[PDB]
């Protein structure tokens, strides 16, 4: 799975927690980064939704092999192709 940086809500909150160690995720940090990007519906979040999304983001960023960020390099803004090839390999 390749995520694209500078795109939207869920993309940015996955892309920020890419290179982080797996134990360094705090459930406080999740809702902190969540409510700024979800600032339209940030107040619509409950604690059970926060712990579910924290568990899911944890179990995703565990498997570091199967994920890549596009990084939105934005100096050439080359293609999706350069990302998709490394995410294949």
């Amino acid at each position: 799975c390749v995520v694209v940086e500078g795109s939207g809500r869920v993309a940015d909150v996955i892309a920020q927690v890419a290179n982080l160690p797996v134990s360094d995720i705090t459930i406080s940090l999740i809702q902190q980064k969540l409510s700024v990007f979800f600032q339209e519906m940030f107040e619509t979040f409950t604690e059970s939704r926060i712990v579910e999304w924290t568990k899911k983001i944890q179990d995703i960023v565990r498997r570091r092999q199967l994920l890549t960020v596009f990084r939105e390099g934005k100096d050439g803004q080359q293609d999706v192709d350069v990302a998709i090839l490394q995410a294949l390999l």
Binding site: V36, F42, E43
Partner: protein, 89 residues
């Protein structure tokens, strides 16, 4: 330390002139009634006064020349007359 002016000035007496500054605080709710949120912390509301020749908002705090009605010395005309003593209780 030193201030640069000898004397009493516009103060009542020498030394300290004792006064009480009360503050009222409450939370700031959204359209739903939940707490509005900052980046991390929350939003707070205080009740302030503006005098016609002060050109400034300030706390309703009075000189502690009377004992218990020093908030009333700030807020007899502001708060109430009889219910003011109840809120002072």
């Amino acid at each position: 330390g030193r201030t640069g002016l000898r004397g009493r000035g516009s103060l009542s007496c020498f030394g300290p002139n004792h006064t009480l500054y009360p503050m009222v605080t409450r939370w700031r709710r959204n359209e739903d009634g939940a707490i509005c949120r900052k980046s991390i912390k929350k939003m707070l509301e205080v009740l302030v006064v503006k005098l016609p020749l002060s050109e400034h908002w300030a706390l309703p705090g009075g000189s502690r020349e009377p004992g218990e009605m020093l908030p009333r010395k700030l807020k007899r005309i502001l708060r109430q007359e009889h219910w003011p003593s109840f809120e002072n209780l």
